[PDB]
Design a protein around this motif. Structure first.
Motif, PDB file in Angstrom:
ATOM      1  N   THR A   1       0.829  -1.201   0.000  1.00  0.00           N
ATOM      2  CA  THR A   1       0.000   0.000   0.000  1.00  0.00           C
ATOM      3  C   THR A   1       0.875   1.267   0.000  1.00  0.00           C
ATOM      4  N   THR A   2       2.020   1.179   0.653  1.00  0.00           N
ATOM      5  CA  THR A   2       2.909   2.309   0.729  1.00  0.00           C
ATOM      6  C   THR A   2       3.544   2.508  -0.634  1.00  0.00           C
ATOM      7  N   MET A   3       4.019   1.424  -1.251  1.00  0.00           N
ATOM      8  CA  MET A   3       4.651   1.549  -2.551  1.00  0.00           C
ATOM      9  C   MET A   3       3.627   2.010  -3.563  1.00  0.00           C
ATOM     10  N   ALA A   4       2.442   1.436  -3.507  1.00  0.00           N
ATOM     11  CA  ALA A   4       1.431   1.819  -4.463  1.00  0.00           C
ATOM     12  C   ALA A   4       1.175   3.320  -4.388  1.00  0.00           C
ATOM     13  N   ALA A   5       1.105   3.858  -3.165  1.00  0.00           N
ATOM     14  CA  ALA A   5       0.846   5.286  -2.981  1.00  0.00           C
ATOM     15  C   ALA A   5       1.961   6.134  -3.539  1.00  0.00           C
ATOM     16  N   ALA A   6       3.205   5.732  -3.264  1.00  0.00           N
ATOM     17  CA  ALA A   6       4.392   6.466  -3.745  1.00  0.00           C
ATOM     18  C   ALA A   6       4.451   6.502  -5.273  1.00  0.00           C
ATOM     19  N   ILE A   7       4.204   5.359  -5.880  1.00  0.00           N
ATOM     20  CA  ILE A   7       4.236   5.255  -7.322  1.00  0.00           C
ATOM     21  C   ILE A   7       3.170   6.136  -7.924  1.00  0.00           C
ATOM     22  N   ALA A   8       2.005   6.163  -7.302  1.00  0.00           N
ATOM     23  CA  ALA A   8       0.910   6.951  -7.806  1.00  0.00           C
ATOM     24  C   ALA A   8       1.195   8.432  -7.663  1.00  0.00           C
ATOM     25  N   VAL A   9       1.919   8.795  -6.620  1.00  0.00           N
ATOM     26  CA  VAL A   9       2.190  10.192  -6.379  1.00  0.00           C
ATOM     27  C   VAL A   9       3.197  10.706  -7.383  1.00  0.00           C
ATOM     28  N   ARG A  10       4.244   9.921  -7.617  1.00  0.00           N
ATOM     29  CA  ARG A  10       5.249  10.316  -8.577  1.00  0.00           C
ATOM     30  C   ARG A  10       4.680  10.504  -9.982  1.00  0.00           C
ATOM     31  N   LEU A  11       3.920   9.524 -10.461  1.00  0.00           N
ATOM     32  CA  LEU A  11       3.310   9.615 -11.781  1.00  0.00           C
ATOM     33  C   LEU A  11       2.511  10.925 -11.862  1.00  0.00           C
ATOM     34  N   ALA A  12       1.580  11.088 -10.922  1.00  0.00           N
ATOM     35  CA  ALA A  12       0.731  12.278 -10.838  1.00  0.00           C
ATOM     36  C   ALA A  12       1.568  13.551 -10.891  1.00  0.00           C
ATOM     37  N   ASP A  13       2.575  13.625 -10.034  1.00  0.00           N
ATOM     38  CA  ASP A  13       3.430  14.793  -9.977  1.00  0.00           C
ATOM     39  C   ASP A  13       4.175  15.027 -11.282  1.00  0.00           C
ATOM     40  N   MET A  14       4.186  14.041 -12.166  1.00  0.00           N
ATOM     41  CA  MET A  14       4.859  14.251 -13.425  1.00  0.00           C
ATOM     42  C   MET A  14       3.848  14.409 -14.555  1.00  0.00           C
ATOM     43  N   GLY A  15       2.639  14.835 -14.202  1.00  0.00           N
ATOM     44  CA  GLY A  15       1.615  15.105 -15.202  1.00  0.00           C
ATOM     45  C   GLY A  15       0.795  13.983 -15.785  1.00  0.00           C
ATOM     46  N   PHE A  16       0.911  12.788 -15.220  1.00  0.00           N
ATOM     47  CA  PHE A  16       0.149  11.660 -15.739  1.00  0.00           C
ATOM     48  C   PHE A  16      -1.184  11.480 -15.053  1.00  0.00           C
ATOM     49  N   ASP A  17      -2.076  10.757 -15.697  1.00  0.00           N
ATOM     50  CA  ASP A  17      -3.369  10.522 -15.095  1.00  0.00           C
ATOM     51  C   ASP A  17      -3.274   9.230 -14.287  1.00  0.00           C
ATOM     52  N   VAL A  18      -3.514   9.311 -12.986  1.00  0.00           N
ATOM     53  CA  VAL A  18      -3.411   8.127 -12.157  1.00  0.00           C
ATOM     54  C   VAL A  18      -4.634   7.924 -11.312  1.00  0.00           C
ATOM     55  N   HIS A  19      -5.061   6.672 -11.243  1.00  0.00           N
ATOM     56  CA  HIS A  19      -6.183   6.276 -10.423  1.00  0.00           C
ATOM     57  C   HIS A  19      -5.611   5.171  -9.524  1.00  0.00           C
ATOM     58  N   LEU A  20      -5.403   5.511  -8.254  1.00  0.00           N
ATOM     59  CA  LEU A  20      -4.871   4.599  -7.256  1.00  0.00           C
ATOM     60  C   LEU A  20      -6.022   3.911  -6.510  1.00  0.00           C
ATOM     61  N   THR A  21      -6.000   2.584  -6.439  1.00  0.00           N
ATOM     62  CA  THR A  21      -7.052   1.876  -5.704  1.00  0.00           C
ATOM     63  C   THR A  21      -6.458   1.203  -4.475  1.00  0.00           C
ATOM     64  N   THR A  22      -7.210   1.170  -3.386  1.00  0.00           N
ATOM     65  CA  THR A  22      -6.714   0.516  -2.197  1.00  0.00           C
ATOM     66  C   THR A  22      -7.794  -0.195  -1.403  1.00  0.00           C
ATOM     67  N   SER A  23      -7.348  -1.206  -0.672  1.00  0.00           N
ATOM     68  CA  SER A  23      -8.194  -2.034   0.158  1.00  0.00           C
ATOM     69  C   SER A  23      -7.982  -1.645   1.611  1.00  0.00           C
ATOM     70  N   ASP A  24      -7.246  -0.563   1.836  1.00  0.00           N
ATOM     71  CA  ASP A  24      -6.969  -0.100   3.190  1.00  0.00           C
ATOM     72  C   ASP A  24      -7.437   1.337   3.398  1.00  0.00           C
ATOM     73  N   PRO A  25      -8.254   1.576   4.434  1.00  0.00           N
ATOM     74  CA  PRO A  25      -8.736   2.942   4.684  1.00  0.00           C
ATOM     75  C   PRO A  25      -7.720   3.841   5.402  1.00  0.00           C
ATOM     76  N   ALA A  26      -6.866   4.508   4.626  1.00  0.00           N
ATOM     77  CA  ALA A  26      -5.853   5.409   5.179  1.00  0.00           C
ATOM     78  C   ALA A  26      -5.007   6.073   4.083  1.00  0.00           C
ATOM     79  N   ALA A  27      -5.210   7.374   3.879  1.00  0.00           N
ATOM     80  CA  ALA A  27      -4.465   8.132   2.875  1.00  0.00           C
ATOM     81  C   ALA A  27      -4.861   9.607   2.889  1.00  0.00           C
ATOM     82  N   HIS A  28      -3.878  10.462   3.152  1.00  0.00           N
ATOM     83  CA  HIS A  28      -4.064  11.907   3.219  1.00  0.00           C
ATOM     84  C   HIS A  28      -5.031  12.509   2.187  1.00  0.00           C
ATOM     85  N   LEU A  29      -4.631  12.514   0.916  1.00  0.00           N
ATOM     86  CA  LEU A  29      -5.421  13.090  -0.172  1.00  0.00           C
ATOM     87  C   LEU A  29      -5.559  14.602  -0.027  1.00  0.00           C
TER      88      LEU A  29
END
Ligand SMILES: Nc1ncnc2c1ncn2[C@@H]1O[C@H](COP(=O)(O)OP(=O)(O)O)[C@@H](O)[C@H]1O
Ligand SMILES: Nc1ncnc2c1ncn2[C@@H]1O[C@H](COP(=O)(O)OP(=O)(O)O)[C@@H](O)[C@H]1O
Ligand SMILES: [Cl-]
Ligand SMILES: [Cl-]
Ligand SMILES: [Cl-]
Ligand SMILES: [Mg+2]
Ligand SMILES: [Mg+2]
Ligand SMILES: [Sb+3]
Ligand SMILES: [Sb+3]
Ligand SMILES: [Sb+3]
Length: 548
Positions: free
Chosen positions: A329-357
């Motif tokens: 879940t941590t790696m998934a979040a990091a990967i999603a953040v980097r892509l996003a921060d580089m202008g890509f469209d990202v849809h991150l899905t998780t099975s755990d209730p916890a994430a700033h946003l």
């Protein structure tokens, strides 16, 4: 140590891969043999490494251990036991039923559930052989059966029940057909496990908030079944002395400390002992015995590099896989953040209730509600015509770890469609065994396609964690899925610290990081242990490292 006092004939150590079960078992065994006790140490791991720790070969035969008078050993290969459990069921129908039918039955006997039941068939024999307690004072196991496996075996429906030959095949009840012994011996084994005068269960954990919660739940499941003789052993604890003159070590010592004082409620009443983190992975008796004491750069690209290459085609399904708590879940979040921060469209899905946003949308699904939908479904579908005892057996089957993995994957499937227009990052996935099972009836080809989908395996720079990851990969490969890359999380050899002990652990990681690079993965990433928890974007941005 409290756990070492007045031990009954059977001692079981439970806890996630790598927490130190075997290490603690060996050291315990030595301690006991040296108090003049006759000890039997049962090695139960898939790639048993116990012979190594005693510098001798061990087998499926009880052999005394030279260097430790009083101690004998026994290896029970779980893969082999499962393989044989499987052969007894399938060989009779080879060349009888058609190949695709047999092959389908074989796949139903190829999951973790079958392995677990096979292991239990082995424990059962040991727990029922009275004579053994005539030769030994203690029998120690470096793994323990789960609450799910025990409940399955205590259900009347497990004997008197024929569940419409698992058609859709969401089932792992296939293994039951292979029960070698009489209903009575398993019943006995279960009494032996529930009898505090006979069995002591040791819950091994680490001073990390997450693990502690998993152990808590394990504790409740087992007490509810009758195993109430339980002891908690917190291993790998960082000695305070080391928090002297170091941001990292002092910070870690700090986080463990909090957790040590805020142990989850359900574990507070249990006898708790702590074992200190040792500088070298124990290889001999001296080393193992030191564990019970009461007083104290690899050339691998950054996670950024992996995101870099994943970015190359502007879209796709990125699936993070690995055992529990390794950091998906941590790696998934990091990967999603980097892509996003580089202008890509990202849809991150998780099975755990916890994430700033912001081109980063997050969908969190609730495992519990999805599991219940799926369970409801499989109940109206396969449960009809089953009597009450049969329905409970089926409901327990729907309590297999994979039940949830299937239901969450089910839900994730709504958005897996967007991997064609953007990035979809998932923090969990079913096993190759489950995928094959689901496919028997699900976007299999999609998952198999190297382009549309890149599966990432998350692991730790540790022996057991790497082996379990390799096995997770082997299974996926059978399902026609090749992990695109491996991410080695929680690394110290890539972190800033002058703590002598930490530098020593970091050096211990070298061999592990090496075997991943040359024997398991094509593309590998290193992530440092961040100290504290990577709860927010800032921290989440630090795990990745930088460009070029
Ligand atoms: N307190 C500790 N400090 C340092 N190393 C430890 C400690 N406990 C275990 N280890 C080392 O950690 C690895 C983890 O393993 P093992 O003890 O085999 O656990 P498990 O049986 O739970 O997988 C081994 O390489 C081992 O010798
Ligand atoms: N590199 C890291 N440094 C510090 N803590 C980490 C790191 N990776 C994960 N963790 C912490 O470990 C837990 C491990 O979890 P998590 O990523 O939820 O994974 P999973 O989905 O694999 O179970 C959480 O408490 C988490 O924030
Ligand atoms: Cl399974
Ligand atoms: Cl199975
Ligand atoms: Cl099972
Ligand atoms: Mg082990
Ligand atoms: Mg998770
Ligand atoms: Sb299963
Ligand atoms: Sb299965
Ligand atoms: Sb099961």
């Amino acid at each position: 140590m409290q756990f070492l006092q007045n031990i009954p004939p059977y001692l079981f150590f439970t806890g996630k891969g790598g927490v130190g079960k075997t290490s603690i078992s060996c050291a315990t065994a030595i301690r006991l043999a040296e108090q003049g006790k006759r000890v039997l140490l049962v090695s139960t791991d898939p790639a048993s490494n116990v012979g190594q720790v005693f510098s001798q070969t061990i087998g499926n035969t009880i052999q005394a251990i030279a260097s430790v008078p009083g101690l004998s050993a026994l290896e029970i290969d779980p893969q082999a036991a499962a393989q044989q459990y499987r052969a007894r069921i399938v060989d009779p129908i080879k060349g009888v039923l058609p190949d695709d039918v047999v092959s389908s039955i074989n796949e139903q006997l190829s999951g973790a559930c079958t392995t677990e039941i096979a292991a239990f068939d082995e424990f059962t024999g040991l727990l029922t052989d009275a004579s053994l307690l005539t030769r030994f004072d203690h029998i120690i196991f470096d793994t323990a059966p789960t609450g799910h496996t025990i409940r399955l075996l205590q259900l009347p429906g497990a004997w008197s029940s024929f569940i419409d030959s698992n058609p859709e095949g969401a089932s792992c009840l296939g293994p039951m057909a292979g029960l070698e012994k009489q209903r009575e011996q398993y019943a006995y084994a279960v009494e032996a496990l529930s009898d505090p005068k006979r069995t002591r269960l040791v819950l091994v954990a680490r001073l990390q908030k997450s693990t502690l919660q998993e152990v808590a739940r394990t504790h409740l499941e087992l007490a509810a079944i009758g195993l109430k003789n339980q002891y908690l052993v917190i291993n790998g604890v960082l000695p305070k002395t080391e928090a002297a003159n170091d941001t990292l070590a002092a910070a870690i010592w700090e986080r463990e400390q909090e957790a040590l004082a805020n142990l989850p409620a359900d574990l507070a009443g249990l006898p708790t002992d702590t074992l200190f983190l040792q500088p070298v992975n124990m290889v001999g008796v001296s080393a193992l015995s030191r564990l019970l004491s009461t007083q104290p750069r690899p050339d691998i690209p950054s996670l950024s590099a992996l995101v870099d290459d994943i970015a190359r085609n502007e879209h796709g399904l990125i699936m993070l896989m690995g055992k529990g708590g390794v950091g998906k879940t941590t790696m998934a979040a990091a990967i999603a953040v980097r892509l996003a921060d580089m202008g890509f469209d990202v849809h991150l899905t998780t099975s755990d209730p916890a994430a700033h946003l912001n081109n980063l949308q997050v969908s969190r699904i609730d495992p519990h509600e999805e599991t219940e939908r799926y369970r409801q479904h499989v109940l109206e579908t396969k449960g009809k015509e089953l009597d009450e005892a049969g329905k409970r057996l089926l409901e327990e089957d729907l309590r297999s770890p994979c039940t949830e993995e299937i239901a969450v994957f089910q839900a994730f499937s709504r958005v897996i469609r967007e991997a064609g227009k953007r990035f979809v990052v998932m923090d969990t996935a079913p096993t190759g065994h489950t995928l094959l099972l689901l496919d028997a009836t699900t976007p299999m080809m999609l998952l198999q396609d190297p382009e549309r989908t890149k599966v990432l395996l998350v692991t730790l720079p540790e022996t057991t964690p790497v082996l379990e990851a390799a096995n997770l990969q082997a299974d996926l490969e059978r399902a026609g899925i090749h992990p695109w890359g491996w991410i080695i999380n929680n690394s110290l050899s890539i972190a800033d610290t002058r703590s002598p002990l930490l530098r020593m652990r970091a050096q211990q990681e070298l061999p592990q990081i090496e075997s991943v690079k040359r024997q398991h993965a094509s593309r590998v990433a290193l992530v440092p242990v961040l100290a504290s928890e990577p709860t927010g974007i800032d921290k989440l941005k630090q795990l990745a490292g930088h460009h070029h």
